[PDB]
Design a protein around this ligand. Sequence first.
Ligand SMILES: *CC(=O)[C@H](CC(=O)O)NC(=O)[C@H](CCCCNC(=O)c1ccc(Nc2cnc3ccccc3n2)cc1)c1cccs1
Ligand SMILES: *CC(=O)[C@H](CC(=O)O)NC(=O)[C@H](CCCCNC(=O)c1ccc(Nc2cnc3ccccc3n2)cc1)c1cccs1
Lengths: 88, 88, 173, 173
Amino acid sequence: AIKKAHIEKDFIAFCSSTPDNVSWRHPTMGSVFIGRLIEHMQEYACSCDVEEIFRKVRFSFEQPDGRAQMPTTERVTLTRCFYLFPGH
Amino acid sequence: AIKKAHIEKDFIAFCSSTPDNVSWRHPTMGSVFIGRLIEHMQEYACSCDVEEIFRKVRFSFEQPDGRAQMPTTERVTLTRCFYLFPGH
Amino acid sequence: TSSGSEGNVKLCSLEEAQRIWKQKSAEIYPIMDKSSRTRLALIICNEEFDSIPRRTGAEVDITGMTMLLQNLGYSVDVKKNLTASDMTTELEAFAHRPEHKTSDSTFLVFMSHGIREGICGKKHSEQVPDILQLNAIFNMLNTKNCPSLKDKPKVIIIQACRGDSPGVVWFKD
Amino acid sequence: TSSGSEGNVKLCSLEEAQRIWKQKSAEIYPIMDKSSRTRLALIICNEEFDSIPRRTGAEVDITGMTMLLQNLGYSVDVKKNLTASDMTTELEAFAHRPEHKTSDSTFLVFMSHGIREGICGKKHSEQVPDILQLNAIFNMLNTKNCPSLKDKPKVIIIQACRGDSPGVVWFKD
Ligand SMILES: *CC(=O)[C@H](CC(=O)O)NC(=O)[C@H](CCCCNC(=O)c1ccc(Nc2cnc3ccccc3n2)cc1)c1cccs1
Ligand SMILES: *CC(=O)[C@H](CC(=O)O)NC(=O)[C@H](CCCCNC(=O)c1ccc(Nc2cnc3ccccc3n2)cc1)c1cccs1
C-alpha cells in the first residue's frame, strides 16, 4: 500500500550572515564563517547536536568588530536532534 | 562613545507549516499548531529552551495524517538558549 | 495549582533553575527581576475578512495564546481584523513601547489566512493583494527600528497557510 | 591523534554516546552502521567569475570543508565554478545518487558571491543575473525530488553575502 510523507522535513540550513548583509572572506585565511564552523564542528560534534553547534558558531560572532556578521539558521524542519557521533 | 551592534540578532520565528503548504484549523477546536504549541509550552517551558520546545512541537507532527503539516523554525539568530523560567 | 498567575504552565523549581544555570555556561539569555520587569507581547489575529472565508475557531487560538503569554509573564496586546497597513502601524507602535527597555524579551503572534508571499490582511483578495511579509516583521523589530529590544529574544509565531499545497507526497511501504 | 580518519575532529566515546542516547529519548536521528553506510556530501564552490571579483582564499575553505566532512564520515564531491543552471543539474544528479539509500544523512555546502535573492553562478552580472535561490536547493532535496533522503537530516551550509549592507547599527554606551 501507499503512505503519506511530509514533502519537506529534516532540513537545516546555516547561512554566513543575516538577510541584506555581507559575509567576510580573507585572501589567505579563507571565509571566517567557514573557518569558525569547522573549528566548532571539530570541538563540539562529539557532544552537541548540529543545531546546538550552529548556535555556538553564532555566539562566537556576538561581539561585533570591524567585520560584523551574524550567521543565520534557516528553514528548520529537524524533528529530532542530529548528533554526528564522530568515531562511530 | 558609540559602539556597533548587529542590526539583526536574537530572533526566532516559528511558522505553522513549510513554505508552499497549508496549515489546518478546526471551527471549534482552533488551529492545531496553536493548540499544540500551547500544550508543549505548558509542559516544557520549565525544562527546555524555546528552540527545543519548537522542535518538540515539530516532532508531534512527524507522522502525517489526513491533515499533514510541518511547522518550521525560521531565520534564527538566537546566540544563547532562551529559557522562560516559568514561576520566575 | 492552576489558580496562580502561571495557570496551566508547569513551574520551574529553584533546583531546576540552578541546574539549567549550571549545565549551560554563559549561553543563556539573562532574565530580568520579576518585581520590576515589564514584559510585553502582541497578538494580531484576523478572523473577519472582506473577500476570504471567516476563520471560525480563531477565538480559541486568541484565548489560548493570550492566557499562555500572560502565564509566562507577558502583558498581552490583542489586535483584531487589520489590513497589512494597520498591522505595520501596530508593529511600529509596538516597537516604540517604553516597556521594552525594562523587558528581557518579547513574543509576537500572527494568526490569519496566508499565501506564499506572507500573511493576509482583512481586505485581501487576488485582485487587490493585502499582504504583510515576514521580512517586514523582522525589519520592524530589529536593532535599527527597535533598539530597546537589542540583545533580547524576539519570538515570532505565525499561524497561516504558506500556499495551496497539501504538503505531502506518497511512498510505498 | 589526528592521524586517523576523523583527523582533528574530537571523538565521541562509547560512554558519551550512551549518555546522549540516555539523556534524550526517541528524539535523536538514527545512525546507520559504519561498516555498511554510504554517506555522501556535496561542495559547490565558485571562485573564478566572468564579471565579479575572484574569491581569493576559497581554496582554504574547500580544503577545510572537504577534510571536515570526510572526518565526519562523508564521501565528498567537489564541484567548482558553475553557473546556476550547472548547479541545478549537479544538485539533481546528487539527489539521484543511489548511495543516499544506504546513508543516514547528507551535507550540502555552497560557497560563492551572493545577493539578497540568492547565490551567484560563475556568469553572474547585474545586466544578466545568474542566481540559484535557496528555495530551489530545498525543493531539489525534498521528499518529492529526493525520496532516498526521506526522514534523514539534510544540512545546507551557505557562505555568501545576502546583500550590500554592513549588518550593523550604532548605539551609545
Ligand atoms: C490556508 C489558510 O490560510 C488557513 C490558515 C488558518 O486559518 O489558520 N487555513 C484554512 O483556511 C483552512 C483550514 C480549515 C480546514 C477545515 N478543518 C478541518 O478539516 C479539520 C478537521 C479535523 C480537525 N481535527 C482536529 C484535531 N485536533 C485538534 C487539536 C487542536 C486544534 C484543532 C484540532 N483539530 C481539524 C480541522 C485550510 C484551507 C486548505 C487547507 S486547510
Ligand atoms: C559579498 C560576497 O558575496 C562575498 C562572500 C564570499 O566571497 O564568501 N564577500 C566578498 O566578496 C567580500 C569579502 C572580502 C573582504 C576583504 N577581506 C577583509 O577585509 C578581511 C580582513 C581581515 C580578516 N581577518 C580574519 C581574521 N580571522 C579569520 C579567521 C578565519 C578566516 C578568516 C579570517 N579573517 C578577514 C577579512 C566583501 C564584500 C563586501 C564586504 S565583505
